[PDB]
From a paper:
Cerebral malaria is a deadly outcome of infection by Plasmodium falciparum, occurring when parasite-infected erythrocytes accumulate in the brain. These erythrocytes display parasite proteins of the PfEMP1 family that bind various endothelial receptors. In particular, subclasses of DBLβ domains found in group A, B, and C PfEMP1 bind ICAM-1 (Bengtsson et al., 2013, Howell et al., 2008, Janes et al., 2011); CIDRα1 domains from group A PfEMP1 bind endothelial protein C receptor (EPCR) (Lau et al., 2015, Turner et al., 2013); and group B and C PfEMP1 contain CIDRα2–6 domains, which bind CD36 (Hsieh et al., 2016, Robinson et al., 2003). Here, we used structural biology to determine how a group of PfEMP1 proteins interacts with intercellular adhesion molecule 1 (ICAM-1), allowing us to predict binders from a specific sequence motif alone.
Of these, a complex of the PF11_0521 (PlasmoDB: PF3D7_1150400) DBLβ3_D4 domain and ICAM-1D1D2 formed crystals that diffracted to 2.8 Å resolution. The PF11_0521 DBLβ3_D4 domain adopts the classical DBL domain fold, consisting of a core of α helices, decorated by numerous loops. The DBLβ domain interacts with ICAM-1 through a complex, elongated binding interface that contains three distinct subsites with a total surface area of 1,144 Å2. Site 2 is formed by the subsequent linker of the DBLβ domain and forms hydrogen bonds with both ICAM-1 D1 and D2 domains. The parts of this loop not in contact with ICAM-1 are not observed in the electron density, indicating flexibility.
Numbering used by the authors:
A (entry chain A): 727 to 1026, 1038 to 1125, 1157 to 1187, 1194 to 1214
B (entry chain B): 1 to 186
The structure:
Amino acid sequence: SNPCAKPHGKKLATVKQIAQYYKRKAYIQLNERGSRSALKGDASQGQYDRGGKADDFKTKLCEINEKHSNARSNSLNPCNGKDNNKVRFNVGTPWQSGEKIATATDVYLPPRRQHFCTSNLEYLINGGHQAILNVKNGKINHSFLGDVLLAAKYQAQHTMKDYKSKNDKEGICRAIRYSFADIGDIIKGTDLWDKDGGEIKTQNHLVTIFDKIKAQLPKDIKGKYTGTKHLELRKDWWEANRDQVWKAMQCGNDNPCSGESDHTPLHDYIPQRLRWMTEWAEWYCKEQSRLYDKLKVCEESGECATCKEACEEYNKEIKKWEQQWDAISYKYLMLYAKARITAINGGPGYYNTEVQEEDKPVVDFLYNLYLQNGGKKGPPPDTHRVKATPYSTAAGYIHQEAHIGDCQKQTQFCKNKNGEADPTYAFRDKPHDHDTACKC
Amino acid sequence: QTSVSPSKVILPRGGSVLVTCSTSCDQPKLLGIETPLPKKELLLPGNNRKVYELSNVQEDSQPMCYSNCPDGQSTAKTFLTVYWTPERVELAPLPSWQPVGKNLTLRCQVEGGAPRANLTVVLLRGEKELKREPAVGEPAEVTTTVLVRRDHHGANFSCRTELDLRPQGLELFENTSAPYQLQTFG
Ligand SMILES: O=P(O)(O)O[C@H]1[C@@H](OP(=O)(O)O)[C@@H](OP(=O)(O)O)[C@@H](OP(=O)(O)O)[C@@H](OP(=O)(O)O)[C@H]1OP(=O)(O)O
Ligand SMILES: *[C@@H]1O[C@H](CO)[C@@H](O[C@@H]2O[C@H](CO)[C@@H](O)[C@H](O)[C@H]2NC(C)=O)[C@H](O)[C@H]1NC(C)=O
Ligand SMILES: *[C@@H]1O[C@H](CO)[C@@H](O)[C@H](O)[C@H]1NC(C)=O
Ligand SMILES: *[C@@H]1O[C@H](CO)[C@@H](O)[C@H](O)[C@H]1NC(C)=O
């Protein structure tokens, strides 16, 4: 059972079950707008200024390279200049945050996301070069999918090449699923890392490219899309092309990754903030394990000096992560409260919650997560009066969805079992089995 | 000195709202909220910021965020605007059988419904509007005169209310009365 949830007998609804609810809503929308045939691209029907043969996308998709692109030649390949020092999958890599990273508050950037193979997408429009915009009529969509498939293939292959322990087949797939979803948010325009200049340019190009895609849509289809940034169009483009993008990410893998729904992941239906929060807990547990392993020298005052420095190194480093976890917890707490209040008020149409534009799908996801876990919907009885949960906290969410297997002894993400902290607390000053050991 | 988010709220009655009282000071002596509404304070690390969940909002309230600061005591207000559909939408009892040529008065009484500036009352013969006026007074009375004709035999007359909350991004809340089926003779 959940060690961070108050005693409950409610019928549990997992995040994946909500992601499937959003998967169903995504294809219902695309089919009702009848834009699938017009939005689904065929990269073999595109034009590629870098030299690559278009047909390769049909005949030998896993053989495509930097030549099968419309990116400026200075962008040598999608992974060019990304993670030179190779820190991405290093156990203790710090997660950057603040106003310099995201508009949305209390966002922690995954190093895997920081060093992402999207260089081709960044250099599609750069200093005069705009090959993607100069392609023959009716090929912009097809040529765009080519660069998206190339960025996806290179991102997955970069992961297979530099992942910590190649034998961890599940770990590689976990990162490939996160990368797939992150590609989706970049394409959809919902990516949180919006303060980075290169990422700003990538998004500016995506709008310019979608200005042309929309212009080449049929009269009846074109009218169903409104918005300067083409957010609804980009949402439907992703739904129409995400299956191809996923298959491109299996290229060169001796151990291909499974898709839990229709042979594709559900992750790209979970909002980015929640996904990144899950990844944070998983990569903290790796660091907690590394720091716990340094206390092996403390097998026993005296000659326990090597233990005293190991106990304090554990303390100073764990508290560095706890500060990030607190900001993550207190933001999630606010967002869940907003979602629960929306449900108490009767959901959308009955109540418009005050929240950052970036957190609207997060409040919406947690709203359905609340309702499906036993939460009471509908407006209060006084609205239409006639005359005569385990996911309530970020700690509870983590124990339900995140891989915490790497955390040694200190595993509980909440200070208290349901509501001085517990000895099994993840962010404790020292491990509970090393209490007498650290006090030599 | 004292700030409040949101500054203006539109919510259904009996509903809840999340209010954040904040101050310009770092370490204030006093920080709270004056309201007779049931409140649950959400525990946060901030000592100059306090989050409150206000429940059972039955009527228009002005919860006052207060803060005693070294520079001086300051107050901030949020404007809660409550909404609810009419409690009673009904046409005045009228006998079904009416003779051809009669000057028939249809009276509809509308009990409640707020905000009144967004509530309008409609009198219809089937789906055709006869009289549409904004709901004024308690109870709001809408009247129309129909000259009874042979053609209206079997026709259904109804009273409808429209609480249009779409300008502030909500739904248009519709309500219909019990229909009156006219039966003609002569
Ligand atoms: O075509 P409209 O410009 O809408 O004219 C209407 C129409 O009747 P006519 O088609 O005979 O002109 C109405 O009747 P309906 O089409 O809605 O059935 C109405 O009658 P109501 O009393 O049913 O609202 C009324 O006709 P009347 O004088 O018979 O009441 C009036 O036509 P007038 O210009 O002749 O007044
Ligand atoms: C009730 O009706 C009034 C009038 O239509 C609405 O007021 C408008 O609201 C929009 C958005 O807030 C403003 O941009 C307009 O300037 C307002 N017009 C006037 C004349 O005041 C009001 O929002 C409606 N109430 C609700 C709850 O939707
Ligand atoms: C008004 O409409 C709502 C929603 O359809 C309904 O719940 C309520 O009972 C209705 N009230 C009256 C007075 O008809
Ligand atoms: C009036 O309503 C009744 C049902 O209450 C229906 O049988 C009848 O057809 C309606 N009259 C007209 C003119 O549609």
